[PDB]
Amino acid sequence: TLSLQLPWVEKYRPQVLSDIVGNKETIDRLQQIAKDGNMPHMIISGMPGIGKTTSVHCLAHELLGRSYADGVLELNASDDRGIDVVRNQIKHFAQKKLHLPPGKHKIVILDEADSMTAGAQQALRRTMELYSNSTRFAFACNQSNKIIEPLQSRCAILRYSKLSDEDVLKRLLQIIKLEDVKYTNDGLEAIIFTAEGDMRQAINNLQSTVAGHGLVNADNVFKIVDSPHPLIVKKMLLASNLEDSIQILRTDLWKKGYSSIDIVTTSFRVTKNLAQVKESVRLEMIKEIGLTHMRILEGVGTYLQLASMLAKIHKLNNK
Amino acid sequence: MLEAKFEEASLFKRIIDGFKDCVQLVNFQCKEDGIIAQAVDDSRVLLVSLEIGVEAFQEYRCDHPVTLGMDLTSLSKILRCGNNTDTLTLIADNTPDSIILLFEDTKKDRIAEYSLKLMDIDADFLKIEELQYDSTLSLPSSEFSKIVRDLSQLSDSINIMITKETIKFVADGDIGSGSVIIKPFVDMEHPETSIKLEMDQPVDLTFGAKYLLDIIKGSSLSDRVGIRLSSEAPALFQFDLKSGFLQFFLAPKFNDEE
Amino acid sequence: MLEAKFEEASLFKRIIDGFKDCVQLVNFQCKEDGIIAQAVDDSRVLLVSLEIGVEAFQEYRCDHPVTLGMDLTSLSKILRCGNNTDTLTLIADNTPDSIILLFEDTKKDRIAEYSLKLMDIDADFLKIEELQYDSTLSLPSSEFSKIVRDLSQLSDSINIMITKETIKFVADGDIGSGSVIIKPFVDMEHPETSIKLEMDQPVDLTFGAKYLLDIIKGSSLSDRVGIRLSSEAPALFQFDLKSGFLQFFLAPKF
Amino acid sequence: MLEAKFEEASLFKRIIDGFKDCVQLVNFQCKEDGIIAQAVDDSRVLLVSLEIGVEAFQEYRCDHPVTLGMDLTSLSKILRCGNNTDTLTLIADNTPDSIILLFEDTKKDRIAEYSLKLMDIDADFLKIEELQYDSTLSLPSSEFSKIVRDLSQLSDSINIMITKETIKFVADGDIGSGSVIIKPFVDMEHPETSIKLEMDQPVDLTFGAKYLLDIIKGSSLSDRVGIRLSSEAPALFQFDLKSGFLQFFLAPKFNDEE
Amino acid sequence: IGKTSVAHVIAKQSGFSVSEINASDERAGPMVKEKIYNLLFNHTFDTNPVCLVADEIDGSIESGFIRILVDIMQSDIKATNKLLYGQPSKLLTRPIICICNNLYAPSLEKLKPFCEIIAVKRTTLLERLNLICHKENMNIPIKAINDLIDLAQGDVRNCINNLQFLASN
Ligand SMILES: Nc1ncnc2c1ncn2[C@@H]1O[C@H](COP(=O)(O)OP(=O)(O)OP(O)(O)=S)[C@@H](O)[C@H]1O
Ligand SMILES: [Mg+2]
């Protein structure tokens, strides 16, 4: 081996706002903005792998044309983004003179805005306020609550949502048509099921299954990829009889190499996000999952502790 | 346009050393009779004001004044390439986004050129200098530096008191008190060491030691320092240049005011 | 065994000053024709390579090569006892657990002797030097240091560009941009100040300023520095010694 | 009362440099035959003892001994005003609450005067010096400093071993071991570089390197250092002054005792 | 509730140029002193007389700002009495508006006797946003503006940014 090929997430990364199968409303909004111009300060929030960075990249590219190289300032979490950088480099870029069309503006893209320190975020306020006629700011984050309210007050808020089954299925069908891959309906269904609204993870699993077996079938997808860890945990907690839950925990989780910490933590998440049972029984199950945890963290993490946690949860559900 | 060539990059480097630390933003303006620059610290108790006449340069051309603001720190960062003996030329167009510093050695050999990004500052030069001050005195600047360096250790406030034929610097704090008393005198063996004093009215003002410490830097530009004090305005500490001067105006402490 | 006596402890101290900071582990090997040493930084972008021939020593004896690895920091910690004028003798047996540094003054008077613990490093000396480089240039090392010290303030990257009869160093960052342009020239009034350049092909490479800053230290070992650049390999910055040389190979950016 | 004038403020500044860092409180006492001072560190392994005879001063007057204690840090903070060449006068009444340091230049010109607050310390001067020590040696103090600075890097303990005609300093720690061996010798080309040794009994003591490092400061007061060692008491390192001496008594490590 | 906005609008409506000072940020009354004295006694380059608006006066932990205002008031009372009763001094010719959250703050006890006290009770934001909508030619239903005010919790800056984002769409 001498060199590798580009992954399908990067190779087929959308370069035009029409290729994005994300939230239709915000996509058409950004398309009309790039068509008319006058892009305002924006903050795009959501979950990983739904088309946030690609969306702002496509918007900046379409809005700047060939001037993207000298009119767009990209700053990721991999670069220093402290108070000194905001004071010197961002201010020098915002004060920089640049002849642009009468409908465009310089764009400052800040990826992972939820990781910037409080001082830099505070200094960015007047930085974006005094140069709001020749410099525009686009933040891309996962938690909008991590950005201070003064910064959110000077910008639009775009909350991206999970991708429905239809959109990811359409994108995967387009990728298969562009790549000439042998597939089947159940295989694509299993891929979308294991993706959980994550387009990047879906394309990655598809490419991995293709390069590992060639045929995208549910058997191959399940043998190479793991059935959503949370679903087996939910089926274990929602069991009606103790022996069924014990057998599930033994075979599916413990005999496959899942650590006790992952089991208990996944267990907590499933419960917190549960809606089948009432609030009080959910709180009692969370209490039992957490007292056990307190023992799991102390190094007493074994199968007996999880079995006792399940027994206590069933006793709580035993009226 | 801006086109000013200093014989020795060293002069400009020492001038900027004077603005250094005590101010962040400086507003320069070149014109037909030279270059001026003003910088005010954040608390607004210190104003640094420069004037360099046409004759201080080896070559100066100006057919159209240009005003330009910049970050002092950025400027000094770049101001250590002068080799001191290098030639320095400041260059800028009539509507600049940058200021070009061009250092060249006598021979064509090595040419260090910088393009510093400018800041937009609302042009608002102050003209706070007074016609007459209560008292005026000059003395060797190295002596003034020592006086300031002594007292500084004792307090954050240094008082300057002037009475007929007497100048007294005083500091009083936790560990105790100190004072330096100097008297006017003409030394013919070399008058650059004399201490002159013209008092129209006794004065007694207090200044924040941190600021006087910033001001003493001017010693590197002139052998003597002129100090003009008034109960009506900021004090003036001045360091003369060949065709020019560097001035520091410092507001007296009200009771607590630097 | 290892038995190498330096006339002046100062030479060894300056040599080690060159490895200092930029590398942590150094692998020395003494043999019949002298001593060599190699050290690679953690990111593997810089290789420091030394060669000291037999003639650089006042006394050198080797009937059996010895390879020894050590922590650079530990070595420099001990390398400030040379009085510079002291005599320094490096000593080690054929299967050493330590390296002995022996500093002595002319008279029997004062004898400072150290026994430095060695580290085991898999012997794997690199031989990455090229036959021909795209361009070759030498200039006073103090001049090169100034050039690097200037530009460093502006950016974390300094570009070196070579065209016929022109060498240009450039840095461009937040506060602005800077450049230093030098031209080849022979100064007969003293040729140690000349600037030579042999260009077979124009080159244009970018280096991390932090590394060039580590490299300039070699000025203390030689009046001139040789710089060899290629688009096919790490750049070579070389500082000649009397019978020997200190070389820094630096991988260009992307 | 206390009235001691040093010709050069520098001598006092170097003396205090010796107490500096290693001790916090110093107890001075002036009397008819001079000034003495003692300071003990918190762990009580080091005693710094000073003696300045009447002849070391340009003017000394004492008709009534005065004992005064003070914070060393406060004193040094004030001890950088001497210009070294300034004249220094220590002044205090018979029942002082402060000590006055008066620095004056030859001419009436500048007078820096300090009033340092005193601390109350129970007078309890120690007299731990021995009649005879197991071994005695002197050598250039710069040489002793180098010896200490070498070994210090290797360990927190430096051992001094003495046998007939042999003095050996040794340190052994993590990175390895080191030793400095010196031999007695008379250099007529200048005897201030000689290394004398009088051994009545071989000695072998260990000291905490951090303390020896504090002690080497005395080099600035004398060309030579005298080291007296005993297995029965703290070691004595002595730096002679013109009419006086600065002594450091250091307790050997028991196995772990500085 | 719009205390700052009401002070600004009424001062501008009365033909005054408004100069705002945040009293909590200015930790140098004795220095600020020069700013306040220049703003009260020097002619501005503007044709319009200056009105001083001091915001957050209850946040000044150091009584410097309030002492300066009290000293200015006492100096003007002494100067007025000299004009009334003086047989043959900078008079205050400019209005001062101060804004606090707490009236019974200990720092304000000395200032209260010189002040006309006005309570602003808990609509004004809706009126302002409607005026912005009308000037930007945006036909927004009053219901959606109320829902935006409720979303923004009475933050005027957040309201205007959300309105600007609705306009771009
Ligand atoms: N709507 C979409 N249409 C097509 N491909 C998409 C879409 N969303 C994501 N992708 C793919 O996922 C890759 C990465 O998308 P990103 O925008 O980087 O994910 P993200 O939404 O920004 O979440 P992060 O970066 O983890 S916070 C892209 O290069 C595409 O290949
Ligand atoms: Mg992203």
mmCIF file of N, CA, C and O in Angstrom, chain B residues 34-86:
data_model
loop_
_atom_site.group_PDB
_atom_site.id
_atom_site.type_symbol
_atom_site.label_atom_id
_atom_site.label_comp_id
_atom_site.label_asym_id
_atom_site.label_seq_id
_atom_site.Cartn_x
_atom_site.Cartn_y
_atom_site.Cartn_z
ATOM 1 N N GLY B 34 6.159 68.346 9.524
ATOM 2 C CA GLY B 34 6.662 67.254 10.322
ATOM 3 C C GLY B 34 5.643 66.235 10.731
ATOM 4 O O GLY B 34 4.553 66.135 10.158
ATOM 5 N N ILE B 35 5.998 65.482 11.761
ATOM 6 C CA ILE B 35 5.142 64.436 12.264
ATOM 7 C C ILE B 35 4.771 64.673 13.709
ATOM 8 O O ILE B 35 5.602 65.109 14.500
ATOM 9 N N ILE B 36 3.505 64.466 14.045
ATOM 10 C CA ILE B 36 3.113 64.565 15.440
ATOM 11 C C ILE B 36 2.436 63.237 15.783
ATOM 12 O O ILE B 36 2.099 62.453 14.881
ATOM 13 N N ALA B 37 2.340 62.937 17.069
ATOM 14 C CA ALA B 37 1.694 61.705 17.518
ATOM 15 C C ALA B 37 1.163 61.918 18.929
ATOM 16 O O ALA B 37 1.761 62.664 19.710
ATOM 17 N N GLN B 38 -0.013 61.370 19.220
ATOM 18 C CA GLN B 38 -0.589 61.486 20.554
ATOM 19 C C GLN B 38 -1.151 60.165 20.999
ATOM 20 O O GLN B 38 -1.718 59.424 20.201
ATOM 21 N N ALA B 39 -1.011 59.872 22.277
ATOM 22 C CA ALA B 39 -1.546 58.623 22.835
ATOM 23 C C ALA B 39 -1.987 58.929 24.258
ATOM 24 O O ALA B 39 -1.301 59.671 24.987
ATOM 25 N N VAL B 40 -3.163 58.424 24.623
ATOM 26 C CA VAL B 40 -3.715 58.647 25.960
ATOM 27 C C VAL B 40 -3.938 57.276 26.577
ATOM 28 O O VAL B 40 -4.377 56.369 25.873
ATOM 29 N N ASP B 41 -3.558 57.096 27.847
ATOM 30 C CA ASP B 41 -3.773 55.807 28.497
ATOM 31 C C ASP B 41 -5.276 55.585 28.807
ATOM 32 O O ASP B 41 -6.053 56.539 28.716
ATOM 33 N N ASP B 42 -5.693 54.360 29.184
ATOM 34 C CA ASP B 42 -7.128 54.089 29.414
ATOM 35 C C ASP B 42 -7.767 54.908 30.502
ATOM 36 O O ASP B 42 -8.928 55.264 30.400
ATOM 37 N N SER B 43 -7.039 55.163 31.577
ATOM 38 C CA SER B 43 -7.601 55.927 32.666
ATOM 39 C C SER B 43 -7.612 57.405 32.374
ATOM 40 O O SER B 43 -8.048 58.194 33.213
ATOM 41 N N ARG B 44 -6.999 57.796 31.262
ATOM 42 C CA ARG B 44 -6.932 59.199 30.868
ATOM 43 C C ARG B 44 -6.210 60.118 31.853
ATOM 44 O O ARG B 44 -6.675 61.227 32.128
ATOM 45 N N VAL B 45 -5.098 59.659 32.438
ATOM 46 C CA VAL B 45 -4.332 60.519 33.357
ATOM 47 C C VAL B 45 -3.009 60.892 32.688
ATOM 48 O O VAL B 45 -2.294 61.765 33.158
ATOM 49 N N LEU B 46 -2.681 60.201 31.608
ATOM 50 C CA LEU B 46 -1.436 60.434 30.903
ATOM 51 C C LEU B 46 -1.640 60.593 29.411
ATOM 52 O O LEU B 46 -2.365 59.806 28.767
ATOM 53 N N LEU B 47 -1.006 61.632 28.880
ATOM 54 C CA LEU B 47 -1.039 61.906 27.463
ATOM 55 C C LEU B 47 0.413 61.927 27.039
ATOM 56 O O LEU B 47 1.237 62.569 27.699
ATOM 57 N N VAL B 48 0.739 61.188 25.979
ATOM 58 C CA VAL B 48 2.095 61.189 25.430
ATOM 59 C C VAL B 48 1.979 61.920 24.075
ATOM 60 O O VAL B 48 1.214 61.525 23.191
ATOM 61 N N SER B 49 2.743 62.983 23.923
ATOM 62 C CA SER B 49 2.662 63.817 22.745
ATOM 63 C C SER B 49 4.032 64.033 22.111
ATOM 64 O O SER B 49 4.969 64.516 22.757
ATOM 65 N N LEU B 50 4.138 63.674 20.839
ATOM 66 C CA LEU B 50 5.371 63.801 20.085
ATOM 67 C C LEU B 50 5.334 64.820 18.932
ATOM 68 O O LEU B 50 4.312 64.989 18.252
ATOM 69 N N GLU B 51 6.479 65.436 18.674
ATOM 70 C CA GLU B 51 6.612 66.367 17.567
ATOM 71 C C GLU B 51 8.013 66.181 16.990
ATOM 72 O O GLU B 51 8.986 66.246 17.727
ATOM 73 N N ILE B 52 8.107 65.874 15.702
ATOM 74 C CA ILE B 52 9.393 65.690 15.024
ATOM 75 C C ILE B 52 9.346 66.627 13.813
ATOM 76 O O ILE B 52 8.520 66.450 12.909
ATOM 77 N N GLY B 53 10.213 67.626 13.793
ATOM 78 C CA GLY B 53 10.206 68.556 12.677
ATOM 79 C C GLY B 53 10.869 67.946 11.479
ATOM 80 O O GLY B 53 11.547 66.914 11.569
ATOM 81 N N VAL B 54 10.689 68.601 10.342
ATOM 82 C CA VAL B 54 11.244 68.146 9.065
ATOM 83 C C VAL B 54 12.758 67.929 9.096
ATOM 84 O O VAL B 54 13.280 66.980 8.488
ATOM 85 N N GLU B 55 13.456 68.787 9.830
ATOM 86 C CA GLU B 55 14.902 68.708 9.937
ATOM 87 C C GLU B 55 15.458 67.517 10.693
ATOM 88 O O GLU B 55 16.641 67.232 10.582
ATOM 89 N N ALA B 56 14.624 66.813 11.451
ATOM 90 C CA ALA B 56 15.092 65.622 12.179
ATOM 91 C C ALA B 56 15.291 64.432 11.230
ATOM 92 O O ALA B 56 15.894 63.433 11.603
ATOM 93 N N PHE B 57 14.776 64.551 10.010
ATOM 94 C CA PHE B 57 14.846 63.486 9.016
ATOM 95 C C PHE B 57 15.943 63.698 8.007
ATOM 96 O O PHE B 57 16.383 64.817 7.789
ATOM 97 N N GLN B 58 16.326 62.618 7.335
ATOM 98 C CA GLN B 58 17.347 62.696 6.308
ATOM 99 C C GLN B 58 16.616 63.001 5.019
ATOM 100 O O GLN B 58 17.170 63.559 4.103
ATOM 101 N N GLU B 59 15.353 62.626 4.963
ATOM 102 C CA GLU B 59 14.545 62.880 3.800
ATOM 103 C C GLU B 59 13.096 62.848 4.280
ATOM 104 O O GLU B 59 12.687 61.942 5.009
ATOM 105 N N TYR B 60 12.332 63.859 3.885
ATOM 106 C CA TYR B 60 10.938 63.978 4.277
ATOM 107 C C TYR B 60 10.177 64.645 3.151
ATOM 108 O O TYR B 60 10.530 65.717 2.688
ATOM 109 N N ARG B 61 9.093 64.024 2.747
ATOM 110 C CA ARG B 61 8.307 64.563 1.686
ATOM 111 C C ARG B 61 6.841 64.451 2.077
ATOM 112 O O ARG B 61 6.376 63.388 2.483
ATOM 113 N N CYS B 62 6.109 65.552 1.979
ATOM 114 C CA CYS B 62 4.704 65.534 2.314
ATOM 115 C C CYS B 62 3.913 66.532 1.520
ATOM 116 O O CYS B 62 3.993 67.714 1.773
ATOM 117 N N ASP B 63 3.082 66.063 0.619
ATOM 118 C CA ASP B 63 2.265 66.962 -0.172
ATOM 119 C C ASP B 63 0.829 66.749 0.220
ATOM 120 O O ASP B 63 -0.062 67.292 -0.414
ATOM 121 N N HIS B 64 0.593 65.962 1.263
ATOM 122 C CA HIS B 64 -0.775 65.652 1.634
ATOM 123 C C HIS B 64 -0.761 64.915 2.959
ATOM 124 O O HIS B 64 -0.345 63.761 3.045
ATOM 125 N N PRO B 65 -1.131 65.603 4.034
ATOM 126 C CA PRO B 65 -1.168 65.024 5.372
ATOM 127 C C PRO B 65 -1.883 63.695 5.427
ATOM 128 O O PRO B 65 -2.866 63.468 4.695
ATOM 129 N N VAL B 66 -1.381 62.815 6.292
ATOM 130 C CA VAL B 66 -2.006 61.504 6.497
ATOM 131 C C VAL B 66 -2.060 61.250 8.007
ATOM 132 O O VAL B 66 -1.117 61.602 8.714
ATOM 133 N N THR B 67 -3.220 60.817 8.499
ATOM 134 C CA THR B 67 -3.427 60.494 9.897
ATOM 135 C C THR B 67 -3.555 58.944 9.962
ATOM 136 O O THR B 67 -4.243 58.306 9.135
ATOM 137 N N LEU B 68 -2.869 58.329 10.910
ATOM 138 C CA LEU B 68 -2.932 56.895 11.025
ATOM 139 C C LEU B 68 -2.821 56.428 12.448
ATOM 140 O O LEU B 68 -2.027 56.956 13.211
ATOM 141 N N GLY B 69 -3.677 55.493 12.827
ATOM 142 C CA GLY B 69 -3.666 55.012 14.192
ATOM 143 C C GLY B 69 -3.170 53.603 14.257
ATOM 144 O O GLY B 69 -3.354 52.824 13.327
ATOM 145 N N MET B 70 -2.479 53.276 15.335
ATOM 146 C CA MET B 70 -1.992 51.929 15.476
ATOM 147 C C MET B 70 -1.753 51.502 16.864
ATOM 148 O O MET B 70 -1.590 52.309 17.774
ATOM 149 N N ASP B 71 -1.709 50.189 16.994
ATOM 150 C CA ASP B 71 -1.451 49.548 18.242
ATOM 151 C C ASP B 71 0.038 49.685 18.555
ATOM 152 O O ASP B 71 0.909 49.311 17.771
ATOM 153 N N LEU B 72 0.324 50.255 19.709
ATOM 154 C CA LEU B 72 1.690 50.475 20.132
ATOM 155 C C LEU B 72 2.459 49.175 20.258
ATOM 156 O O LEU B 72 3.609 49.099 19.839
ATOM 157 N N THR B 73 1.847 48.162 20.851
ATOM 158 C CA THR B 73 2.531 46.894 21.022
ATOM 159 C C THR B 73 2.994 46.299 19.699
ATOM 160 O O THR B 73 4.133 45.823 19.599
ATOM 161 N N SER B 74 2.126 46.345 18.686
ATOM 162 C CA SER B 74 2.453 45.814 17.358
ATOM 163 C C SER B 74 3.656 46.548 16.776
ATOM 164 O O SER B 74 4.548 45.940 16.178
ATOM 165 N N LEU B 75 3.667 47.862 16.960
ATOM 166 C CA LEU B 75 4.733 48.709 16.467
ATOM 167 C C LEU B 75 6.065 48.385 17.124
ATOM 168 O O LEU B 75 7.061 48.241 16.432
ATOM 169 N N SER B 76 6.106 48.284 18.447
ATOM 170 C CA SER B 76 7.374 47.977 19.111
ATOM 171 C C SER B 76 7.854 46.587 18.744
ATOM 172 O O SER B 76 9.048 46.389 18.537
ATOM 173 N N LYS B 77 6.930 45.644 18.594
ATOM 174 C CA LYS B 77 7.304 44.282 18.218
ATOM 175 C C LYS B 77 8.145 44.338 16.978
ATOM 176 O O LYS B 77 9.041 43.532 16.796
ATOM 177 N N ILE B 78 7.831 45.282 16.108
ATOM 178 C CA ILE B 78 8.540 45.419 14.845
ATOM 179 C C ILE B 78 9.708 46.371 14.932
ATOM 180 O O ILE B 78 10.617 46.344 14.096
ATOM 181 N N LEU B 79 9.740 47.139 16.004
ATOM 182 C CA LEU B 79 10.768 48.128 16.168
ATOM 183 C C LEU B 79 12.100 47.692 16.758
ATOM 184 O O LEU B 79 12.822 48.491 17.322
ATOM 185 N N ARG B 80 12.431 46.419 16.638
ATOM 186 C CA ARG B 80 13.742 45.967 17.086
ATOM 187 C C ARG B 80 14.557 45.435 15.872
ATOM 188 O O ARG B 80 15.493 44.662 16.041
ATOM 189 N N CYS B 81 14.220 45.865 14.653
ATOM 190 C CA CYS B 81 14.936 45.411 13.446
ATOM 191 C C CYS B 81 15.867 46.484 12.902
ATOM 192 O O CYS B 81 16.623 46.272 11.930
ATOM 193 N N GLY B 82 15.834 47.636 13.555
ATOM 194 C CA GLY B 82 16.631 48.750 13.081
ATOM 195 C C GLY B 82 18.129 48.645 13.161
ATOM 196 O O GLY B 82 18.821 49.538 12.684
ATOM 197 N N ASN B 83 18.647 47.620 13.831
ATOM 198 C CA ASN B 83 20.106 47.505 13.995
ATOM 199 C C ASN B 83 20.639 48.820 14.579
ATOM 200 O O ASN B 83 21.854 48.963 14.782
ATOM 201 N N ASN B 84 19.718 49.740 14.885
ATOM 202 C CA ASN B 84 19.999 51.062 15.391
ATOM 203 C C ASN B 84 20.686 51.924 14.347
ATOM 204 O O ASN B 84 20.367 53.107 14.200
ATOM 205 N N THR B 85 21.614 51.327 13.609
ATOM 206 C CA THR B 85 22.381 52.041 12.599
ATOM 207 C C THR B 85 21.734 51.926 11.242
ATOM 208 O O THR B 85 22.207 52.528 10.270
ATOM 209 N N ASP B 86 20.735 51.054 11.147
ATOM 210 C CA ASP B 86 20.011 50.885 9.890
ATOM 211 C C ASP B 86 19.313 52.212 9.594
ATOM 212 O O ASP B 86 19.069 53.042 10.486
#
